[PDB]
Design a protein around this ligand. Structure first.
Ligand SMILES: O=C(NC1CCN(S(=O)(=O)C[C@H]2CC[C@H](NCCCC(F)(F)F)CC2)CC1)c1cc(C2CC2)on1
Ligand SMILES: Nc1ncnc2c1ncn2[C@@H]1O[C@H](CSCC[C@H](N)C(=O)O)[C@@H](O)[C@H]1O
Ligand SMILES: [Mg+2]
Ligand SMILES: [Mg+2]
Ligand SMILES: [Zn+2]
Ligand SMILES: [Zn+2]
Ligand SMILES: [Zn+2]
Length: 426
């Protein structure tokens, strides 16, 4: 018995609404992807199948592009990799855009696979394309993706009889652009891109009543507020650390809509997000383009070097509540954790705690993860009362956003028991 149902909204296309009253933390839907792939930066760093990082990965011998954590993952991935393998090998050394590799997997799944549970409420065929809202520049970009797909897939798909009935590649890429999900690992690093057509029914809010979280490729949809019968379910499509102007640009560019929510009408939190000297944070925002690229490719030493030059600059500095400063602290923290620089990681992480309380109101999985990271760093440094407070706060958030079905909650329970045993021996 589903707790959610598809419906036709008055002015947002189709949507999802509650069939029963919902409480924070309630699991509403869970889904594997219709199709997914590792993303550009994480290719060869994480396993193609389970999206977990490993010090050494085994490569597919035929294409040498797909890489796996284990013989189990390589073999289990073979049915969904078999046809793309010949295309990837034929295209070497050229690697396709993520969207092109993704749509290849969509096509093979729809041609060769049984009907997917991911499409229970809504299918790839049903997805919004927004084609009549596309500007000419966007249509041109989609045409180039179509031609890139035809080149990449030529070994496996030569004509329309090898595509699903009435399949239009331009329309398919339009759907991919507006309906791709960024798959994040347990630490909230972007590691993949996938299509989850039933989850695509969720419309956007900058102050949503639901949240999604990834456990490998698996997606969990949970309520994060009380929700009444008939009430529309929403998620936030975007990073919370964005001004209303930034959200406006991305929602127009990628999703072809103008957001009418209260936060956008009132520029909610914009002024607090942009405190400090504008010339300074404009420079930091510029530097973050490279920092974000380095982080996406797991280049932690390079990330840390650039972040330290900002955090410890000889020149003017920013308040930690400035969102570009905050992003630099976040990246520096994550780099230090991955490099084993645990004292420095804790310094940066502790500084983010109050800004995160302000910018992630309610129960948000990203703040849950951040607080867990800080609590774990404090546990390792022997600060048991401080660690316990943060681990308990992380649990209060993550019991709602992640839940028992997410493996990170089991990890958190072990940290809480270890911290508690230390306190009791003191
Ligand atoms: O992919 C979808 N949403 C995303 C929203 C964002 N999250 S997140 O949980 O906040 C994790 C993010 C936290 C920030 C992190 N970036 C930090 C970079 C900072 C810099 F630049 F300084 F380096 C990246 C991960 C993931 C899911 C989606 C699609 C749809 C379709 C339209 C239906 O809905 N939702
Ligand atoms: N808050 C919002 N206001 C207006 N349109 C929205 C919206 N959130 C999502 N959408 C629409 O939904 C698309 C994302 S997919 C969400 C389901 C979609 N409404 C459908 O009918 O299939 C966006 O590109 C936009 O067309
Ligand atoms: Mg349509
Ligand atoms: Mg329309
Ligand atoms: Zn694996
Ligand atoms: Zn291969
Ligand atoms: Zn809004």
């Amino acid at each position: 018995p589903l707790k959610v149902e598809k419906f036709a909204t008055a002015n947002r296309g189709n949507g999802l609404r509650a069939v029963t009253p919902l409480r924070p933390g309630e699991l509403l839907f869970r889904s594997d992807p219709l199709a997914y792939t590792v993303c550009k930066g994480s290719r060869g760093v994480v396993c193609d199948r389970c999206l977990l990082g490993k010090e050494k990965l085994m490569r597919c011998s035929q294409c040498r592009v797909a890489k796996y954590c284990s013989a189990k993952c390589q073999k289990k991935a073979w049915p969904d990799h078999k046809r793309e393998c010949k295309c990837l090998k034929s295209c070497k050394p050229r690697y396709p855009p993520d969207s092109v590799r993704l749509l290849g997997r969509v096509v093979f799944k729809l041609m060769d696979g049984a009907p997917s549970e991911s499409e229970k409420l809504y299918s790839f065929y049903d997805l919004e394309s927004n084609i009549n809202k596309l500007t000419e520049d966007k249509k041109e970009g989609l045409r180039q993706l179509v031609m890139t797909f035809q080149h990449f897939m030529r070994e496996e798909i030569q004509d329309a009889s090898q595509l699903p009935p009435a399949f239009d590649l331009f329309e398919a890429f339009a759907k991919v652009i507006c309906n791709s999900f960024t798959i994040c690992n347990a630490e909230m690093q972007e590691v993949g891109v996938g299509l989850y057509p039933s989850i695509s029914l969720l419309n956007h809010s900058c102050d949503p009543n639901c949240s999604i979280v990834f456990n490998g490729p698996h997606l969990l949809l949970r309520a994060v507020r009380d929700i009444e019968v008939g009430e529309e379910l929403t998620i936030c499509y975007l990073d919370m650390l964005m001004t209303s102007e930034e959200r406006r640009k991305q929602l127009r560019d990628q999703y072809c809509f103008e957001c009418d929510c209260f936060r956008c009408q009132t520029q909610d939190k914009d002024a607090d997000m942009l405190t400090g000297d504008e010339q300074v944070w404009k420079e930091v925002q510029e530097s973050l383009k490279k920092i974000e690229e380095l982080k996406a490719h797991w280049k932690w030493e390079q990330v840390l070097a650039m972040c330290q030059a900002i955090i410890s600059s000889n020149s003017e500095r920013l308040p930690d509540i400035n969102i570009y400063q905050l992003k630099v602290l976040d990246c520096a923290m994550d780099a230090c954790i991955n490099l084993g620089l645990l004292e420095e990681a804790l310094f940066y992480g502790t500084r983010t705690m109050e800004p995160y309380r302000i910018f992630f109101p309610g129960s948000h999985p990203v703040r849950g993860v951040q607080v867990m990271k800080v609590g774990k760093l404090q546990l390792h440094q022997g600060m048991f009362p401080q660690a316990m407070k943060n681990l308990r706060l992380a649990f209060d958030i993550m019991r709602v956003t992640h839940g028992r079905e997410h493996s990170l909650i089991e990890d958190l329970i072990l940290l809480l028991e270890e911290c508690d045993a230390n306190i009791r021996a003191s």
